[PDB]
Amino acid sequence: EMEKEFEQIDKSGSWAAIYQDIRHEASDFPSRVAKLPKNKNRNRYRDVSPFDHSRIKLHQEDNDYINASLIKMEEAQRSYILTQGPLPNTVGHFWEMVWEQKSRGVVMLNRVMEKGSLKCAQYWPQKEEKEMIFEDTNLKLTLISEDIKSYYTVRQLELENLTTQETREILHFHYTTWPDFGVPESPASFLNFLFKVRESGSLSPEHGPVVVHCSAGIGRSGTFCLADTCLLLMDKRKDPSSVDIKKVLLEMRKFRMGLIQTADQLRFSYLAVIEGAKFIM
Numbered sequence: 001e002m003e004k005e006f007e008q009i010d011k012s013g014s015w016a017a018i019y020q021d022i023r024h025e026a027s028d029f030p031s032r033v034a035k036l037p038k039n040k041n042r043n044r045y046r047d048v049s050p051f052d053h054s055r056i057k058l059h060q061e062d063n064d065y066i067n068a069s070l071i072k073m074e075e076a077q078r079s080y081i082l083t084q085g086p087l088p089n090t091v092g093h094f095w096e097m098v099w100e101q102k103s104r105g106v107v108m109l110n111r112v113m114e115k116g117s118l119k120c121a122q123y124w125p126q127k128e129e130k131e132m133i134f135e136d137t138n139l140k141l142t143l144i145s146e147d148i149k150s151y152y153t154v155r156q157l158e159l160e161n162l163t164t165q166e167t168r169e170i171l172h173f174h175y176t177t178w179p180d181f182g183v184p185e186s187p188a189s190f191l192n193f194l195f196k197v198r199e200s201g202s203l204s205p206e207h208g209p210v211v212v213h214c215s216a217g218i219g220r221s222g223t224f225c226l227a228d229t230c231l232l233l234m235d236k237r238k239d240p241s242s243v244d245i246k247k248v249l250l251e252m253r254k255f256r257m258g259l260i261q262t263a264d265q266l267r268f269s270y271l272a273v274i275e276g277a278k279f280i281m
């Protein structure tokens, strides 16, 4: 059982050591499309690239590239698109991907500004009456409603395909209280947030995959998917205690590099799953 494994790594302070074994064991696949010169300004970080085998392709004939990966968790029947915080030049691409993949929900785990730097473009409207048009991708985006709470904000946006006049409801779930440094002290507000995303239907197989991002789409984004998948596997399996976080993380790392950036994020992931299991058991 992971609870016992937690006290062991904690009492022994072996987190950096566990983390390094995961680093060592992690898959490595070509990312040739990311590294093409024409795609240099579509990447926020030069060392964070989608693998070619799992990358999302835009349906635009010119350049099909976006820094986004499909994570398919076969046993849990869960898919996620992990992407970087959009750049000023990729906000159009980001909404094209949401449209093309039939995503219901966008999960945002960062603030637009952290540590006095811009971590993300402002890719959604701030007021009902001031909609955004993405001329490059022929999409219009309108803020319908905004529900601001202590730890997160839920926004009801509407996506309109200007080419076809189809419109769709998109839910934007914005976790606003992740600290600039380290991880939250308690996973309570993060779990509440995750249950709120689940309750919306945004993670359900009726819909395209949820889009999850932070700045790079590997650290906080990783913790989100890892906690969701692990909790679902504990509901699905005959023996809940057969669920090994480390194995789940390594399976997710076949789809996108670097998921969980620090030994602190790994410890927090354990804590979130252990705590979440009490509500589930």
Ligand SMILES: O=C(O)c1csc(-c2cccs2)n1
Pocket (backbone or CB within 6 Å): 087, 088, 089, 091, 121, 122, 123, 124, 132, 133, 134, 135
């Ligand atoms: O920083 C930017 O360039 C930016 C953020 S949102 C946005 C646009 C929405 C619609 C057309 S451009 N641009």
Ligand SMILES: O=C(O)c1csc(-c2cccs2)n1
Pocket (backbone or CB within 6 Å): 144, 156, 157, 158, 168, 169, 170
């Ligand atoms: O009554 C509502 O809640 C309402 C009025 S317009 C609207 C939406 C449009 C597009 C997505 S949600 N909802």
